[PDB]
Design a protein around this nucleic acid. Structure first.
Ligand SMILES: [Mg+2]
Ligand SMILES: [Zn+2]
Lengths: 251, 54, 288, 66, 1316
DNA sequence: CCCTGTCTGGCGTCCTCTCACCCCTATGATCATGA
DNA sequence: TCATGATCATAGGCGGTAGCGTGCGCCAGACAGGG
């Protein structure tokens, strides 16, 4: 990675491989020009310890470091634990077509719908709007449609009301504890910059309104819209899966 | 590098402040008593070449 | 602290009372922090041990299930039969005590009408099919699970119940905490279980067992009181009898282990040589 | 216990996505152990349908065509 | 009497306890510690002189050379603070040191050096502290925070219960040096005694007692008493003192004097001890079985054979008695090894020892330190003398020696910094005494064992580490060169010293970035007692007890102000009156209650002196003399509260505000809030934001003026006098003559700090609040700062609140606000963003900043000038061009997408050599013109003051009334006047004037040099353009507002004016809260604050009514006097009969928007006083007005509570959190979207959400949620084509990060594949 | 070989936001000035 | 014309003639100590 300062603060792996190749080339040269009897041994010990620093740093006695106290990262520190490929990149991923803001009340909602801003609904639902523009014939190519929805002209709000209409979104509170923590709503466009969320539903999220933040996701494909309508809709989950108590208790 | 000195009375950390110090030939925890094969039975050499490595 | 806070929030609190309140409040906040730190890891380990168990058949085809009885600590009945045998398929078909008359068939989901018909006839113990005693290879059949919780009908073929189970256990982990005789209340028949009893000279019934459990059978069949009875305890009553409320029927000594006998005869010493086996320690200030 | 019952599986990807990855991968390396994706979390790893909901019908179709 | 800014608006003050010690200067920890650090300090310690006298003289490796120390000196900084923050340099001062080199001769190191050389040398740059208490490290104002750590000295801890699983407690005795090797004595379940050094391997403890050259006979002489057996004619008689026999059952019949004392089978009673010591029994008779296990003390040798009869510390048998009996010994010395009294811990320890003399012990210690190497007696002596017994590698401080003498019950608190033999022997004696059952262990969290480091001591330690590295360089170079030819600047180099101190002030765990968005946040971030950092504990490891308030935090560390979350109780905040002791502990004031009378002398107690005495509580009633009016008074004796008598008390608290900190003493009615809600209220009061026009608190605590003046945001007058010229830029004070120097004529100029960027992107403004011609006193505010008003502290604004449920829009915690609030522009905060653009140096050539730019037209370039940089004043949108930049390819700086603003300030920095373009020359001419005008006005204004002094002197003594202004004004000296003090004073003013002339010449030349020069910059950058956008963010649904008690809330709907509940006067309420947050979240103080705020506004409305009708000053005087008396025995006692009919009109001009009321913390306004003040206004007594509705126009039943609450806007806004992403950039190593908001990123669909979608039957939603939408690149391009063509369908593929997992597992020796 | 102590390996919540920081010192070579 | 001094540019892994580390805690299973 460049740090935009003329220098490369390198990753730890290139440092480790560079140490192994330095020590290995010096050992090839020392086996070339003959080792002094009981001498071709210290260099092989150094090579073994450099490879043991590369494959799993810190498992052998005291680990190495580049700067300054922190031990640098080997391969087994990229597979294991947190900050590794199993728990940070493969089981939970960062996801396109998503957004997040601060929640609020708005009690004029039916319980299968939530308020969602015009700016968030215009930025989540971009390629739907592109498809409706070149399907109705208001832009020739994709670039004219992109510049139309960047300027936000007076026709794309009608396009946006024609793409929101029967299309669920997934609302998500950030500590998801049980399976009612992800639910699916049908959006209503709001002038403003917050997510208006039905009050009874906030019994299931354990969410007050003292600064809580919720994240919305969009189901792209068709089967995911049917799963966010038949399986995950806010009217269906009125009973908890822990017991038979209703979860729509008026608070 | 081959150096002649005496271990106990002159303790090493005093002499540490200088070069000549990475550490002993060991093959083990203790500083291994090295042979001087070149000094004893292999004095004059390098007929390998003067390849001037690479 | 032996000097309590005699001031409420409508009036003032002076400095020391507010300081003692601060002791309590910061102890609570640190409990909530490290409590969340353990609770999240408990949910992780449970959803990673279950992780895989999918309702993959529709009938295993066994009979052996677990026995659901209402729990009895020794006071009021805490969890009744309706709230335990709600919606789970019966193991052996329940026969009412009009024996050889079937009340429910042996594969009937016990929803709310059937639970009320269980409560009316005062059914003892509806033996019921549990997940742990199933027979499906690589998964769990549908009938041994029960009702689809969060819905009304039986469980659908497929819903991953290990994950919803592990979340339902670990999700209230945020709410949890981190850091002489037998007195009766109700009235009914008297039951004893695992007892070796004998008759004393006083005419009562004394016990020669630690494993004795006393029970209070009520008027319609079930049990409303249970008491672990110690070793060598002395009952004022017997088995199958009838008592009244507020009547302590048993007494013992929790300090002394009684070595009471069965037959009536003299006492001698066998393999008891003085100086080695038994020592001479005279009780000085009493005499005996 | 549940951490030992989850580390002792016939599927090394589940026991690798749980606790210590070094011991699980070395034991499965010298044993030549062969996962067959066996349930939910390995299919979440590899990027295909869960065999729980709609993917359960898909997996019955896929296993029936085997 | 009152100061003149206290006659502007005198705050009404309830409160009953008459104060005796005012609030000290709140920034005294930082300033006093760093003044202790850098100052010319004689007599050795403390300061930099301690380091320079402990690491010097550097003496060489026997080369007879020596580099000794003379003195040091810091020159002036090249850059003052403002130029340093603008440009970006450190605010440092060069540290010149005078070092001396001496070189001894041969055969006489006690002989004469042949040559010396003393000279000045440059080393390091230590950063100075500004007057606010902060550092400027790289243009960013940073604070070093005090650390709370363990006090050096002995410490007797007890590892209770947990070890060995049998309840047998251990006891360890950690000696904690200030610098050096640790030392832990401990036990084990076999009751042996084990030493260890720096947590290394374990040895039996007496191996170090042989290392101090003790023979074993002397060791048993120290650690045990003696028992004497005399062989006198019958059965080897015994000397017996019966105190050892207290409860022991004898094995025989003890008789003496022909009298049976003790029977066999019984124990010796205390009265039998009295009998034996009353009859003075000395020699008793023992059997042959009594000395069957007695342990001998010293060695007995047989005189004939020359052999050893029995070794030391050995039990005696029959044959050993038979050997020593026939050798000629009549005295036998043994030891007393009881079960309860004295265990044989030393004896079992010596039986585990293999060693036998000093040499073997030193060999074993040298072997446990450095494993596996040949020891030598010289090396073992050198190591064990350099562990504990050398001035170099081991040093307790004075704090360490005080605790080490105090915890061992010594007398002198002075000693050496090194240990000795008596010290370790007393540690082992006290450890054995604690094991025996007498004496107590020491807890950890007790604040007599927690020292407070600060900026000075930590900077001294880092500077000392730099000096030991440089002595590790000077010892290398000094004896390996030719002498005499070098000077002591060729040897010592400034790289490790400057690197060490620059790394500490630059990036440490305690040198942290100042949270600066509020005067309160500054003055409570500088007062912070952090437990973390180097030498302390860590957050994710420990623990339970350290996160808990100990009983001795009372008046030292605040109990209620601490951050909730992962570190509660570790980021403690220091209290109000809490100073720091001489050693580093905490101390707090008290009042010495002599036997009857509370004497008004203050008297500072530490944390361990508080425990012995008995302290009365702060609010105890006393009748005008000090006599306690009760006969039972609530006190606290030894960490435990109780009820004591009237005149057994020894101290009383000073004021009732001293348990709390300055964060949580601005909360009115603190005693009514539950402690959780007071914690959240203090933390959110720290997190406020400055509004546009900050008002005042109607209900304060009187602590606002200390927090405002004692911080550094207001412009406090230095010398009082008369204002001469007020302006929005500057303020000129003319100094009064009874405060004024004779020379340097003197009228002061305050250059205010106008609109500039803070650290939290707020707008740190200063507004002048004085009129012209106005008198000001010494110690008084002239210019209000951010969130100040007339010298008070106004964080948020005070608004009309009602507690009622209003149609669901305030459901959980939400807040509902009228449009009357946003129309008045009263929360409209002003933010400033800094946007930088560098001109780097790459290949194909350098870059271009000029406006000849491809791919753009008129519509972009109309807002730029002819040289690329945007104008000053051009109001831009989100996504225009500010700086046009093209590389050898458009890379112009743009406004980031979303923010508006107005460009207020443009800086251009040029690396020297590069051609300045036309706008950089425009800024250079501009700043030349500004600095030229400013220094010329300095000369003109000070010359005007000097000529006014000349006119003031020439009033008498040869006065010329007409002849004074006929001649030009620069010659007012040669007029008719003899040799007096006046011609002397005119000569001194001529000296001052010519000094100002030549000083103005040289300073204008230096300022032209500073403007004209280039600046040292990054490697390979041409010029840096910085542009300051100034956004004005108003309010909207989604911002966070909160009061001062923990009542948070997202504002949920900005209603119109008409819908608000109004009352039967006509006025709409501004904010409708929710009542249901009160009984659960027990913050009942906000309702008393609401009622008292309504009382304050009722008095303000009556003043507005009595003034709007143009009434004469008599009725205003009447009503203001009635509103200022109004209470019990209070402290205020003002009278308006000494305000003289013009100040009363101006005081009423300041009271007409409400009357400010002080309510101190625990001595506040009771309920009856609020009722009596609500009766003075014509408001209802219960505080509740009946309110109509705005929609229906019909009355709400059951009348509701209205009043004024002082609510704060927090800077968790909603157009800083809101974010959305369709398709942006993707990361490089794993093809997943980036993280964050500045990077246009997507929200993390974490692991528990994957579990929650497995928990439903949603399978396709999860498949596209982790294959199509996230990772698979061909899958997502197929998806994007399919979405813009209307075909909702996914082609799945594989995650690319799983292929990364395959490459990382495959890059090991592991062969992972994909079968079939 | 049968305990029983020690040792060293594992593990210790989620999501988001902000900020700084990310070699300096020494040696060698070249150029300029002075003798 | 030659030599010396000063300034600028380019180049690597405790810094030193030792010693720094020291405020988590539980569980568990193997390795070994004692008997
Ligand atoms: Mg909340
Ligand atoms: Zn089954």
């Amino acid at each position: 990675v460049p740090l935009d300062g003329g220098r490369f603060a390198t990753s730890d792996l290139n440092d480790l491989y560079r140490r192994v190749i330095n020590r290995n080339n010096r050992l090839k040269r020392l086996l070339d020009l003959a080792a002094p009897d009981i001498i071709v041994r210290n260099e092989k010990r150094m090579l073994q310890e450099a490879v043991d620093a590369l494959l799993d740093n810190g498992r052998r006695g005291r680990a190495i470091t580049g700067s300054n106290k922190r031990p640098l990262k080997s391969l087994a520190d990229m597979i294991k634990g947190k900050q590794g490929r199993f728990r940070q990149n493969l089981l939970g991923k960062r996801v396109d077509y998503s957004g997040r803001s601060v929640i609020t009340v708005g009690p004029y909602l039916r319980l299968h719908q939530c308020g969602l801003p015009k700016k968030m609904a215009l930025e989540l639902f971009k390629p739907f709007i592109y498809g409706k523009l070149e399907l109705r014939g208001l832009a020739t190519t994709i670039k004219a449609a992109k510049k139309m929805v960047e300027r936000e002209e007076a026709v794309v709000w009608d396009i946006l009301d024609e793409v929101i209409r029967e299309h669920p979104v997934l609302l998500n509170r950030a500590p998801t504890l049980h399976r009612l923590g992800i639910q699916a709503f049908e959006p209503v466009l709001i002038e403003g910059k917050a997510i208006q969320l039905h009050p009874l539903v906030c019994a299931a999220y354990n969410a007050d309104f003292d600064g809580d933040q919720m994240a919305v996701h969009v189901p792209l494909t068709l089967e995911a819209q049917l799963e966010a309508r038949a399986l995950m809709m806010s009217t269906n989950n009125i009973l908890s899966p822990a017991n038979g108590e209703p979860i729509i208790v008026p608070s | 590098l081959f150096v002649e000195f005496d271990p106990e009375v002159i303790h090493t950390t005093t002499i540490n402040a200088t070069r000549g110090v990475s550490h002993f030939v060991r093959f083990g925890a203790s500083p291994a008593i090295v042979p001087s094969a070149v000094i004893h039975q292999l004095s004059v050499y390098k007929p390998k070449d003067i390849v001037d490595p690479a | 602290i032996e000097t309590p806070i005699t001031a409420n929030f409508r009036e003032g609190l002076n400095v020391l009372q507010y300081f003692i309140s601060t002791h309590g409040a910061r102890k609570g906040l640190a409990d909530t922090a490290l409590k969340t730190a353990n609770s999240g890891y408990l949910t992780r380990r449970l959803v990673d041990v279950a992780q895989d168990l999918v309702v993959t058949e529709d009938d295993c085809g066994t009979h052996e299930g677990i026995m659901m009885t209402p729990v009895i600590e020794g006071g009021d009945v805490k969890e009744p039969l309706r709230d335990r045998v709600l919606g789970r398929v019966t193991a052996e078909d329940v026969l009412k005590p009009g024996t050889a008359d079937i009340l429910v068939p042996r594969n009937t989901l016990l929803h709310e009408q059937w639970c009320d018909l269980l409560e009316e006839n005062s059914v003892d113990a509806v033996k019921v099919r549990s997940v742990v005693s199933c027979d499906t290879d690589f998964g769990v059949c549908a009938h041994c699970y029960g009702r689809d919780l969060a819905r009304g009908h039986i469980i659908n073929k497929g819903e991953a119940i290990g994950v919803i189970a592990a979340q339902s256990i670990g999700e209230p982990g945020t709410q949890l905490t981190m850091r002489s005789s037998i007195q009766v209340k109700n009235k009914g028949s008297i039951k004893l279980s695992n007892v070796k009893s004998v008759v004393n000279s006083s005419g009562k019934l004394v016990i020669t067992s630690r494993n004795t459990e006393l029970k209070l059978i009520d008027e319609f069949g079930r049990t409303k009181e249970s008491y672990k009875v110690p070793y060598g305890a002395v009952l004022a009553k017997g088995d199958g009898e009838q008592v009244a409320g507020g009547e302590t029927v048993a007494n013992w000594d929790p300090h002394t282990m009684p070595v009471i006998t069965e037959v009536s005869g003299f006492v001698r010493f066998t393999d008891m040589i003085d100086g080695q086996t038994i020592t001479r320690q005279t009780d000085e200030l009493t005499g005996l | 216990g549940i951490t030992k019952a989850s580390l002792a599986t016939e599927s090394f990807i589940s026991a690798a996505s749980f606790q210590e990855t070094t011991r699980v991968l070395t034991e499965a390396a010298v044993a030549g152990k062969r996962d067959e994706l066996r349930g939910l979390k390995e299919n979440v790893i590899v990027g295909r349908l869960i065999p729980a909901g709609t993917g359960y019908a898909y997996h019955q179709d896929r296993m029936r065509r085997r | 009497v009152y100061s003149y800014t206290e006659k502007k608006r005198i705050r009404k003050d309830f409160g009953k306890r008459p104060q005796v010690l005012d609030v000290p200067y709140l920034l005294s920890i930082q300033l006093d510690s760093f003044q202790k650090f850098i100052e010319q300090d004689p007599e050795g310690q403390y300061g930099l002189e301690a380091a320079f006298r402990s690491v010097f003289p550097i003496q060489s490796y026997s080369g007879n050379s020596e580099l000794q120390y003379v003195s040091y000196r810091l020159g002036e900084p090249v850059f003052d603070v403002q130029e340093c923050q603008i440009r970006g340099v450190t605010y440092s001062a060069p540290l010149r040191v005078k070092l001396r080199l001496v070189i001894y001769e041969r055969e006489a190191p006690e002989g004469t050096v042949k040559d010396i050389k003393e000279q000045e040398v440059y080393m390091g740059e230590i950063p100075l502290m500004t007057d606010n208490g902060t550092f400027v490290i790289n243009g960013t104002e940073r604070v070093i925070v005090s650390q709370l750590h363990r006090s050096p000295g002995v410490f007797f801890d007890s590892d209770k219960g947990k070890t060995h699983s049998s309840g047998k407690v251990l006891y360890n005795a950690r000696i904690i040096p200030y610098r050096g090797s640790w030392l832990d004595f401990e036990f084990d379940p076999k009751d042996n005694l084990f030493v260890r050094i720096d947590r290394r391997r374990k040895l039996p403890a007496t191996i170090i007692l042989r290392a101090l050259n003790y023979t074993t006979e002397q060791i048993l002489d120290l650690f045990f008493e003696k028992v004497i057996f005399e062989i006198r004619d019958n059965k080897l008689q015994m000397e017996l003192v019966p105190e050892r026999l207290r409860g022991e059952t004898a094995s025989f019949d003890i008789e003496a004097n022909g009298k049976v004392y003790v029977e066999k089978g019984r124990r010796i009673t205390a009265r039998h001890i009295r009998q034996l010591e009353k009859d003075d029994v000395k020699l008793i008779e023992v059997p042959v079985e009594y000395i069957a296990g007695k342990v001998v003390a010293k060695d007995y040798i047989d005189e004939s054979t020359g052999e050893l009869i029995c070794a030391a510390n050995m039990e005696l048998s029959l044959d050993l008695l038979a050997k020593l009996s026939q050798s000629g010994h009549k005295r036998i010395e043994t030891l007393f090894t009881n079960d309860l009294d004295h265990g044989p811990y030393i004896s079992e320890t010596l039986r585990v020892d293999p060693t036998n003399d000093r040499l073997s012990a030193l060999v074993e210690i040298y072997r446990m330190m450095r494993p596996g190497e040949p020891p030598t007696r010289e090396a073992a002596e050198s190591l064990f003398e350099n562990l504990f017994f050398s001035e170099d590698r081991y040093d307790l401080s004075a704090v360490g020696r005080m605790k080490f003498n105090r915890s061992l019950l010594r007398e002198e608190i002075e000693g050496s910094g090194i240990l000795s033999k008596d010290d370790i022997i007393d540690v082992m004696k006290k450890l054995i005494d604690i094991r025996n059952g007498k004496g107590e262990v020491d807890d950890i969290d007790h604040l007599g064992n927690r020292r407070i480091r600060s900026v000075g001591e930590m900077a001294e330690n880092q500077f000392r580490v730099g000096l030991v590295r440089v002595e590790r360089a000077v010892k290398e170079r000094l004896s390996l060169g030719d002498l005499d030819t070098l000077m002591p600047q060729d040897m010592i180099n400034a790289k490790p010293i400057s690197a060490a101190v620059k790394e500490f002030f630059g990036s440490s765990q305690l040198s942290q970035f100042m949270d600066q968005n509020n005067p309160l946040s500054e003055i409570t971030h500088k007062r912070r007692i952090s437990a973390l950092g180097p030498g302390g504990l860590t957050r994710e490891r420990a623990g339970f007890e350290v996160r808990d308030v100990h009983p001795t935090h009372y008046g030292r560390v605040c109990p209620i102000e601490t951050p909730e979350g992962p570190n509660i109780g570790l980021i403690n905040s220091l209290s109000v009156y809490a100073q720091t002791n001489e050693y580093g502990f905490l101390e707090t004031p008290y009042r010495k209650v002599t036997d009857g009378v509370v004497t008004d002398e203050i008297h500072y107690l530490s944390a361990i002196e508080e425990g012995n005495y008995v302290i009365a509580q702060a609010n105890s009633n006393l009748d005008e003399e000090g006599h306690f009016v009760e006969d039972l008074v609530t006190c606290r004796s030894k960490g435990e509260s109780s009820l004591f008598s009237r005149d057994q008390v020894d101290y009383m608290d000073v004021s009732t505000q001293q348990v709390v900190s300055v964060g949580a003493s601005l909360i009115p009615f603190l005693e009514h809030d539950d402690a959780n809600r007071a914690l959240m209220g203090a933390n959110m009061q720290r997190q406020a934001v400055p509004t546009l026009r900050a008002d005042k608190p109607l209900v304060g605590t009187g602590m606002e003026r200390a927090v405002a003046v004692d911080s550094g945001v207001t412009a406090v007058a230095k010398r009082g006098g008369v204002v001469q010229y007020v302006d929005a830029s500057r303020i000129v004070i003319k100094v009064n003559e009874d405060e004024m120097y004779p020379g340097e004529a003197g009228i002061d100029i305050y250059n205010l700090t106008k609109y500039t960027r803070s650290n939290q992107n707020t707008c740190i403004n200063q507004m002048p609040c004085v009129s012209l011609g106005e008198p000001v006193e010494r110690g008084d505010v002239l210019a209000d700062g951010p969130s100040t008003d007339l010298g008070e502290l106004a964080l948020g604004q005070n608004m009309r609140v009602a507690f009622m449920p209003w149609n669901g829009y305030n459901f959980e915690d939400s807040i509902l606000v009228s449009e009357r609030v946003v129309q008045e522009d009263r929360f409209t905060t002003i933010h400033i963003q800094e946007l930088a653009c560098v001109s780097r140096d790459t290949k194909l050539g350098p870059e271009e900043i000029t406006a000849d730019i491809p791919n753009v037209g008129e519509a972009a370039l109309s807002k730029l000038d002819e040289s690329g940089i945007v104008y000053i004043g051009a109001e831009v949108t989100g996504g225009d061009i500010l700086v046009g930049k093209v590389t050898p390819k458009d890379s112009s700086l743009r406004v980031p997408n979303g923010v508006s603003g107005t460009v207020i300030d443009v800086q251009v920095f040029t690396r020297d050599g590069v051609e300045k373009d036309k706008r950089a020359l425009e800024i250079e001419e501009m700043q030349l013109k500004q600095a030229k005008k400013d220094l010329s006005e300095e000369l003109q204004i000070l010359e005007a003051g000097l000529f006014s002094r000349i006119r003031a002197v020439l009033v008498a003594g040869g006065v010329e009334a007409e002849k004074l202004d006929k001649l030009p004004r620069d010659r007012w000296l040669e007029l008719g006047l003899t040799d007096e003090e006046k011609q002397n004073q005119l000569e001194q003013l001529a000296e001052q004037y010519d000094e100002l002339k030549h000083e103005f010449e040289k300073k204008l030349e230096a300022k032209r040099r500073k403007i004209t020069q280039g600046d040292d910059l990054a490697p390979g950058v041409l010029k840096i353009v910085k542009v300051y956008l100034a956004v004005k963010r108003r309010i909207q649904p989604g911002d966070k507002m909160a009061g001062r008690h923990g009542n948070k809330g997202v504002i949920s709907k900005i209603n119109p004016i008409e819908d608000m509940p109004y009352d039967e006067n006509g006025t709409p309420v501004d904010i409708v809260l929710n009542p249901l947050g009160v009984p659960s979240r027990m913050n009942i103080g906000q309702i008393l604050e609401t009622h008292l705020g309504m009382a304050a506004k009722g008095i303000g409305d009556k003043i507005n009514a009595m003034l709007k009708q143009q009434q004469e000053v008599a009725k205003l005087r009447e009503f203001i006097q009635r509103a200022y008396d109004l209470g019990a025995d209070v402290r205020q006692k003002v009278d308006l009969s000494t305000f003289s009919d013009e100040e009363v009109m101006r005081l009423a001009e300041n009271l007409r928007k409400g009357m400010p009321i002080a309510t101190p913390v625990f001595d506040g306004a009771k309920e009856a006083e609020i009722k009596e003040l609500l009766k003075l206004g014509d408001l209802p007594t219960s505080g509740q007005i009946r309110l109509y509705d705005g929609r229906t126009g019909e009355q709400f039943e059951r009348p509701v509570t209205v009043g004024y609450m002082y609510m704060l806007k927090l800077n968790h806004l909603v157009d800083d959190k809101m974010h959305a992403r369709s398709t942006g950039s993707y990361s490089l190593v794993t093809q997943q979207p980036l993280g964050g908001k500045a990077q246009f990123g997507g929200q993390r669909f974490g692991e528990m959400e994957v579990w929650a979608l497995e928990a439903y039957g949603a399978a396709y939603t999860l498949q596209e949620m982790l294959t199509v939408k996230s990772d698979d690149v061909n899958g997502r391009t197929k998806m994007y084509k399919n979405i813009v063509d209307g075909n909702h369908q996914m082609e799945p593929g594989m995650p690319e990060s799983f292929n990364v997992l395959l490459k990382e597992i495959r890059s090991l020796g592991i062969n992972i594949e994909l079968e079939d």
